[PDB]
Amino acid sequence: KFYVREPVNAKPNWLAVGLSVGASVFMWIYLIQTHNEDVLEYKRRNGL
Amino acid sequence: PFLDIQKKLGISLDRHFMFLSAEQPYKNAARCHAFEKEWIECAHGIGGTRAK
Amino acid sequence: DGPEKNYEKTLAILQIESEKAELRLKEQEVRRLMRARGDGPWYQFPTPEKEFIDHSPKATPDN
Amino acid sequence: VKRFFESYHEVPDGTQCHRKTYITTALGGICGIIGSAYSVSLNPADSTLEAVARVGRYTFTAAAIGAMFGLTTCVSAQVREKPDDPLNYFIGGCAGGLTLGARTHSYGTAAMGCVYMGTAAALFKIGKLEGWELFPTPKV
Amino acid sequence: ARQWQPDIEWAEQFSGAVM
Amino acid sequence: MMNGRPGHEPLKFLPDEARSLPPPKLNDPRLVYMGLLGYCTGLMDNMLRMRPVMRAGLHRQLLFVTSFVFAGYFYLKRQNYLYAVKDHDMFGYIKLHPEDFPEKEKKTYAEILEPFHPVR
Amino acid sequence: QLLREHWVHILVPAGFVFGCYLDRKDDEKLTAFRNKSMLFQRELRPNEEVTWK
Amino acid sequence: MLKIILPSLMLLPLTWLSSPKKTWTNVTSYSFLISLTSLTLLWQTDENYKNFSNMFSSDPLSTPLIILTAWLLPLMLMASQNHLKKDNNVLQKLYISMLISLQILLIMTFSATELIMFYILFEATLIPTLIIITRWGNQTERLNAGIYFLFYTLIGSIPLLIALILIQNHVGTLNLMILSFTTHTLDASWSNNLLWLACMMAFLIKMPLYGVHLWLPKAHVEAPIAGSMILAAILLKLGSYGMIRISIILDPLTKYMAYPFILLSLWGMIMTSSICLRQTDLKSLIAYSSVSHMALVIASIMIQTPWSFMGATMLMIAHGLTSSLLFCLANSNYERIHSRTMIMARGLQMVFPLMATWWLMASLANLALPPSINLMGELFITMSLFSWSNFTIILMGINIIITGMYSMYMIITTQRGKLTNHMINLQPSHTRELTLMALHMIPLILLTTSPKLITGLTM
Amino acid sequence: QWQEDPEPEDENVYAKNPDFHGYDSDPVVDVWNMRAVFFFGFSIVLVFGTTFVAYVPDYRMQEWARREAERLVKYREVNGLPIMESNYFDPSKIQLPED
Amino acid sequence: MNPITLAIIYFTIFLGPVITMSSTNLMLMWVGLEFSLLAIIPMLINKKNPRSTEAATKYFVTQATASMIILLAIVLNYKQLGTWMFQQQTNGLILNMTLMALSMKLGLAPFHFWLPEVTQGIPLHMGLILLTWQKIAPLSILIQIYPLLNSTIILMLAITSIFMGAWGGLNQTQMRKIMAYSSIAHMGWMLAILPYNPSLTLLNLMIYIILTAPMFMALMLNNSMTINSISLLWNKTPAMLTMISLMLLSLGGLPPLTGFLPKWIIITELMKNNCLIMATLMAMMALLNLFFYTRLIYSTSLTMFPTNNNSKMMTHQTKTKPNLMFSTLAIMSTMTLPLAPQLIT
Numbered sequence A: 001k002f003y004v005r006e007p008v009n010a011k012p013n014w015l016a017v018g019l020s021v022g023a024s025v026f027m028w029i030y031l032i033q034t035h036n037e038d039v040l041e042y043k044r045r046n047g048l
Numbered sequence B: 001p002f003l004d005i006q007k008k009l010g011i012s013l014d015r016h017f018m019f020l021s022a023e024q025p026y027k028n029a030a031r032c033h034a035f036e037k038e039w040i041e042c043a044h045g046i047g048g049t050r051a052k
Numbered sequence C: 001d002g003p004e005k006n007y008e009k010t011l012a013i014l015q016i017e018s019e020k021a022e023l024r025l026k027e028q029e030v031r032r033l034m035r036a037r038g039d040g041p042w043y044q045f046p047t048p049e050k051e052f053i054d055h056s057p058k059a060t061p062d063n
Numbered sequence D: 001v002k003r004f005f006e007s008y009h010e011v012p013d014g015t016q017c018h019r020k021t022y023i024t025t026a027l028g029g030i031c032g033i034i035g036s037a038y039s040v041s042l043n044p045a046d047s048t049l050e051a052v053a054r055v056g057r058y059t060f061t062a063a064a065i066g067a068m069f070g071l072t073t074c075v076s077a078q079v080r081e082k083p084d085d086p087l088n089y090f091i092g093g094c095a096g097g098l099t100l101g102a103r104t105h106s107y108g109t110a111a112m113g114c115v116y117m118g119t120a121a122a123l124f125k126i127g128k129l130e131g132w133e134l135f136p137t138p139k140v
Numbered sequence E: 001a002r003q004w005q006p007d008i009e010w011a012e013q014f015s016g017a018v019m
Numbered sequence F: 001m002m003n004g005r006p007g008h009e010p011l012k013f014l015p016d017e018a019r020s021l022p023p024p025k026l027n028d029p030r031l032v033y034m035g036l037l038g039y040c041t042g043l044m045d046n047m048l049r050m051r052p053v054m055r056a057g058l059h060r061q062l063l064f065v066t067s068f069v070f071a072g073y074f075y076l077k078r079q080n081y082l083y084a085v086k087d088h089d090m091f092g093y094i095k096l097h098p099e100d101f102p103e104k105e106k107k108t109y110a111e112i113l114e115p116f117h118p119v120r
Numbered sequence G: 001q002l003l004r005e006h007w008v009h010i011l012v013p014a015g016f017v018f019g020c021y022l023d024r025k026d027d028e029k030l031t032a033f034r035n036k037s038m039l040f041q042r043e044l045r046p047n048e049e050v051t052w053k
Numbered sequence H: 001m002l003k004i005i006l007p008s009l010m011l012l013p014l015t016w017l018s019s020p021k022k023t024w025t026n027v028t029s030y031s032f033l034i035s036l037t038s039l040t041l042l043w044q045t046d047e048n049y050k051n052f053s054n055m056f057s058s059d060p061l062s063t064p065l066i067i068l069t070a071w072l073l074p075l076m077l078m079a080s081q082n083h084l085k086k087d088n089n090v091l092q093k094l095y096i097s098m099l100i101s102l103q104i105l106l107i108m109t110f111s112a113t114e115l116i117m118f119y120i121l122f123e124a125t126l127i128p129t130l131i132i133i134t135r136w137g138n139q140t141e142r143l144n145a146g147i148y149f150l151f152y153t154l155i156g157s158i159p160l161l162i163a164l165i166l167i168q169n170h171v172g173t174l175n176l177m178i179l180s181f182t183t184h185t186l187d188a189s190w191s192n193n194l195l196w197l198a199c200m201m202a203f204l205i206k207m208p209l210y211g212v213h214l215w216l217p218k219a220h221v222e223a224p225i226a227g228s229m230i231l232a233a234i235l236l237k238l239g240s241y242g243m244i245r246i247s248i249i250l251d252p253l254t255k256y257m258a259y260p261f262i263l264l265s266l267w268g269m270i271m272t273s274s275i276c277l278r279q280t281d282l283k284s285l286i287a288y289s290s291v292s293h294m295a296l297v298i299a300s301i302m303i304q305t306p307w308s309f310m311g312a313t314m315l316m317i318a319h320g321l322t323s324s325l326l327f328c329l330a331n332s333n334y335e336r337i338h339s340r341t342m343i344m345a346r347g348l349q350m351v352f353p354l355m356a357t358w359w360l361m362a363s364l365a366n367l368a369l370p371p372s373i374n375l376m377g378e379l380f381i382t383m384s385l386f387s388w389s390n391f392t393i394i395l396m397g398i399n400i401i402i403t404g405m406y407s408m409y410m411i412i413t414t415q416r417g418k419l420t421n422h423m424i425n426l427q428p429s430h431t432r433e434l435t436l437m438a439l440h441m442i443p444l445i446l447l448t449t450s451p452k453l454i455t456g457l458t459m
Numbered sequence I: 001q002w003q004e005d006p007e008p009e010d011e012n013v014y015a016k017n018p019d020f021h022g023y024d025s026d027p028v029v030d031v032w033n034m035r036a037v038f039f040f041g042f043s044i045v046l047v048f049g050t051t052f053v054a055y056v057p058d059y060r061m062q063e064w065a066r067r068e069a070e071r072l073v074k075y076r077e078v079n080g081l082p083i084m085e086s087n088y089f090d091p092s093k094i095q096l097p098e099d
Numbered sequence J: 001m002n003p004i005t006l007a008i009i010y011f012t013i014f015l016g017p018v019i020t021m022s023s024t025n026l027m028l029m030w031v032g033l034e035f036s037l038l039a040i041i042p043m044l045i046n047k048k049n050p051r052s053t054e055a056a057t058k059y060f061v062t063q064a065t066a067s068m069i070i071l072l073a074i075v076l077n078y079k080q081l082g083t084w085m086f087q088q089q090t091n092g093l094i095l096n097m098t099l100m101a102l103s104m105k106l107g108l109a110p111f112h113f114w115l116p117e118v119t120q121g122i123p124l125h126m127g128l129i130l131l132t133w134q135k136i137a138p139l140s141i142l143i144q145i146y147p148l149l150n151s152t153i154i155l156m157l158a159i160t161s162i163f164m165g166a167w168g169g170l171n172q173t174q175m176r177k178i179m180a181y182s183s184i185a186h187m188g189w190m191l192a193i194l195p196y197n198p199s200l201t202l203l204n205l206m207i208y209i210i211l212t213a214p215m216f217m218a219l220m221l222n223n224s225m226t227i228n229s230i231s232l233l234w235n236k237t238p239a240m241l242t243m244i245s246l247m248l249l250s251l252g253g254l255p256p257l258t259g260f261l262p263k264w265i266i267i268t269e270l271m272k273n274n275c276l277i278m279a280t281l282m283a284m285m286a287l288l289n290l291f292f293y294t295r296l297i298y299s300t301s302l303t304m305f306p307t308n309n310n311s312k313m314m315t316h317q318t319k320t321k322p323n324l325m326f327s328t329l330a331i332m333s334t335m336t337l338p339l340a341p342q343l344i345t
């Protein structure tokens, strides 16, 4: 223990870290998915 | 309206008393009921510039 | 690569800028004509809604 | 007064110099009473006597600026027999600026009035020749 | 040799609510 | 100015006709710049809360990047849809009123006589 | 451990090979007129498919 | 060109990620590689202009300016890495970031194919030189100098934006080549006169024209050495480049409308050379010399002759190099004696022999020694001006006489004469500043050897 | 009076490091930063860049236009054609206005 | 202030403008403005100081007079046309009443005399809520009736708004008054572009909001009330001087900042509608706005004003005031200019 008071950021907020990582990976999967069905809708509507 | 929540959800919070031939209590028509009825259905679907 | 690459790339650039210029000019003329006499999709100014008019019989006949 | 200010432009410049001086004096007087009303309302005087005195001084100053501006413009146009030329309005603008400097009692304001009012009157002449629109109706 | 930086008078010219 | 067009759904983000548009390729300068803006936002956040600029809040920087690319991608889809319907309405008006847009016969530099101004 | 210390020396060469890469994409994009310029109209040799890349 | 822009962009992460003991070395070496990479734009084996993309292109006029900016960037670092030794690491990296950003934005500005992007990059370069002058300047007057510089440039540049938007609405695209091909003759009306004045006034302000040149001497006096370099060697040439680009759509009324600016340029170079004769500040004297040389550039660009354009281009490059070199020498003396006084340090020929040789060669470039590109530009400008009107030779000769006068007056009162023996703190020489001297002078020798690279669009 | 530090005096940098090169205070960085600006400024730019632009062929078609001019002078002098026609464009392809 | 009243007042503050945008009726837009006024009065008199009482009283009387001129216009329209809409043939006198009332709602010149007075003497958070949130509902009503407005009086109101805002911003030293005059100039820009295209009006409104929010936040961090207070920010919080400079340059409209984009595209469409004199005068007054911005930057970031002794314990203590939203809004208000075609509809 270095500081005389315990910092509010002494220990990582694990709920916040888990929510951040989960939101990031969920948005990545959702983004790549919507890119894929947008491509498929493009090709099926224009015959490509 | 500037935002169209009213048209999006289909609710009518104030769109049913804009004018005279709108919803009237106990079917008591306002003055000039037929005349601005003709004005609305003339102007509907053609835009403001063509309405004038 | 030689002069023909730059020549044909320049021709493509000049073409693309040419359609961009003439499309912008027609966009200006289309906007001017539509504001003068709105008859297309844009600049359709609002109008009170027709479906909020009663067509049921009422208390007085002279309507 | 719209018909009046349109009747300013009925005749080409250098003709009816008295009429042009009268109408520009009237327009300057209108601008002066507006500015004096704003001055007495934003910054109230200690008594109504000096309040109406300040209104009179501002009205007389603006009327003098407009009067000598229009007068010098018309006389310069008919001396040079060149009616549609912006330099005549530049000379009139400096005449108005020198009237402003004389009423303010400072040659610096006189010179600044010369250059600014000459530029403003010159660009007004270019606008009224080559069809510039100050407050146009929306077209696009 | 040191860079000039604002002193008391240059710092106090900005106080007075009117400038 | 296009809010009054016929068939305009009220307060709609991306209608079904927008699904006829090609999507962004997801590796384009606009989305890359939006991700770089998210990374700069995370770095700025670290510096302002007085942490190491890139050694701190890696999950925060990752979330900033992901959120920025998400918003940029969907906003880009909406803007490409809007520009597509702008050009579509423009071309439709052009074919609807051909007499107001006559095809001019541009004439060559053998009968056009441009003035010559010598620089001497 | 040297790759940790001298990792900054590859950023500028990375920008150079990235800059040359995007310039190649520009040549692929602005190619409406491959072998259509009226000054360079030549029939394609049997061993090639494009005039320039 | 994009292969020039990207590694200069990645210079900034290199600056902010390098060790504090290696940042200067890494950025200087990689910016030298940037200059070497930018040297490839001289591969012009055919007459057609190097249209790299839909938004970047190179020209016989734009190429030397890009190469010049990429060449002065390591010189800016080398000169600035001595007055920043007693400075914070974050502020040092920020100053390097400002220099790199100025170089990037000027490279894009010179390589622009669109005048509105040229304007956006014009103010993009306007910002960080203000930051440099106002934050790292030495005296109190740096804030006033920054205000003067910024608002002269902005009041110039807003009517340029106005005229650009109007001409874009008129023609459609505002692309340089589309304008150059579908150029339309103006009707020589009053609206066209005001349009011409609006689209010319920005570049005339930032050149600077005579009468509106008051921002330049205070900007160079209060500026640091890198700011003095960037202004006096790139931004005035940026104004000239803007005039050469935009003058093609302004026929024919520029024939009579060029009259007041030619007169202003000729009399302005006369009176500013007179100020150089009577001036007590070295940085001010070099600044007013820059005003006179840019007045020559204005006169050539206004008379619109192929000799005038070629001489303007060669004088652009020559004056940029020699003005940066003169400012470097003045700044070396300033970090020696901590004073900008013209007359205070006199006998430096003894203590600094090789630096006095660099002084002599810089002033000989300044007074247009043959066969240097300074003389090539100045002489071909005289040729075109005498073709335009025969009586310009009198003003031109008086300007040339007073130019030689102030250059030799500089040399005599700064190097020759008895030494000021009270100046104990005269460090012998730095290999850093001597290397800076040689890297300024050697490209002048090479461009003298081959003047065909910097001729320009015409010839 | 207001608590300001006194004016710092610039010391003789050559007193501690007699082999000072201008670049940084400690001798190790001083000599390596010197070697960088010479090897990357003088060596690979002022020599290789000078050599690269020295061997650029046909710079703005100068050598081609000399060879083509010699061809056209050869073509015209042996056939009786003038070296230069007064009109660049053939007047039969130009249709002037009637009045 | 308990959570119950906090929730009621904040929800009414939110509900007023949302009613105004979402509602078709002129009556309901008027009552939404009314909701906004009643909801935001107590937070102006939250601190219970005499300056807050003055600000609340001035704001209340000005807003009440504007509301009743709005109500006069609404009732006169309903007499003339029998409906609750300025449809196409409502009287120009009624429309001028609406425009004067909505301008004095907004606080643009020559109805601008209260806005620096009201924003002075109130805490910075309520100045932020005023100068961002309260100016959307009048813009909603104004955008609702864009083609019917009189362009002459619109342009005159706009140009005098920018002139008075630029001159006041040059004169004042207090940060709240500086923000008020900046607000007046920006509303001049939006009001000028309003009849030609409300899309650029909304774009300029969003750009102004996303520039004004983080600058106000930086004012909140130390309650830097004056130019001297924002000048010793180098000793208070040195990591934000760069963003302060960039935000004020974007507020000035220098390229390549994204705050140049609203001014640039507004001027572009002004030339599309041929009002070049108007646009030129507006642009030079925007340069004057940039002048007082640049003087503020000179005071706070580029120079280093003298600091005092207790700033040592200011450095000793630690702060978590800068929220998560500050950096995102700052980056979108600084480096968004290459996304200009995406920002413009």
Ligand SMILES: CCCCCCCCCCCCCCCCCC(=O)OC[C@H](COP(=O)([O-])OCC[N+](C)(C)C)OC(=O)CCCCCCCCCCCCCCCCC
Binding pocket: D119, D123, D130, D131, D132, H155, H156, H157, H159, H162, H163, H166, H191, H192, H194, H195, H197, H198, H201, H205, J276, J277, J280, J281, J284
């Ligand atoms: C740094 C110098 C600053 C001062 C000088 C600025 C340049 C001077 C010349 C240009 C006028 C001013 C800028 C407006 C640019 C207009 C360009 C344009 O499109 O022109 C064609 C247009 C004409 O439009 P048009 O070309 O479409 O005309 C159509 C013509 N018909 C119909 C026949 C087809 O000109 C204008 O609109 C000019 C309006 C100018 C109004 C504002 C003037 C203000 C006063 C000027 C100086 C102000 C700042 C300095 C104050 C004093 C400081 C000490």
Ligand SMILES: CCCCCCCCCCCCCCCCCC(=O)OC[C@H](COP(=O)(O)OCCN)OC(=O)CCCCCCCCCCCCCCCCC
Binding pocket: H039, H042, H063, H064, H065, H067, H068, H071, H317, H364, H365, H369, H370, H371, H372, H443, H444, H445, H446, H447, H448, H449, H450, H452, H453, H454, I045, I046, I049, I050, I051, I053, I054, I055
């Ligand atoms: C392009 C824009 C530039 C802007 C500034 C750039 C600054 C950074 C420069 C980095 C390096 C790039 C150098 C660019 C110039 C290189 C010079 C060069 O080698 O030119 C090629 C030339 C041969 O070319 P060639 O075509 O044969 O010549 C014309 C014949 N028709 O080769 C030669 O003639 C040989 C040259 C080297 C041999 C030694 C020459 C010694 C000359 C001594 C001169 C003495 C007198 C000097 C007087 C000075 C007075 C002030």
